[PDB]
Design a protein around this ligand. Structure first.
Ligand SMILES: CC(=O)c1cc(-c2cc(C(=O)NC3CC3)ccc2C)c2ncccn12
Length: 102
């Protein structure tokens, strides 16, 4: 409800439109991605980011952007480059960093 919450909710809504399949909508579990929890130490996803906005855990755009980058970096580390997840992570990271610099 704070100004920062309002702005981050705006960014998050526009970012989620760039992931229409919801590959980033909720945590990647091992049942979806074998061995994921043994490769990725600090998982992140849009659903957790929403939860953190609501809990007022972000105090700046820079902190929100860092979680967004973590989410996309995780996908590029776990997934090979020829996969849809690696490619989407690269594409939305660019979109989001452009959007949060405007
Ligand atoms: C972010 C990430 O690394 C990730 C996300 C998913 C994922 C895939 C689907 C799906 O239905 N895919 C088939 C349509 C092509 C649905 C929901 C999720 C969360 C995933 N699956 C395997 C390896 C990595 N991932």
């Amino acid at each position: 409800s704070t100004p920062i919450q309002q702005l981050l909710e705006h960014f998050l809504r526009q970012l989620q439109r760039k992931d229409p399949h919801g590959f980033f909508a909720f945590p990647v579990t091992d049942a979806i991605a074998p061995g994921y929890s043994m490769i990725i130490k600090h998982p992140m996803d849009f659903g957790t980011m929403k939860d953190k906005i609501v809990a007022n855990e972000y105090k700046s755009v820079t902190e929100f952007k860092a979680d967004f980058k973590l989410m996309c970096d995780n996908a590029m580390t776990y997934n090979r480059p020829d996969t849809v997840y690696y490619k989407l992570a690269k594409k939305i990271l660019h979109a989001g960093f452009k959007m949060m610099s405007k």
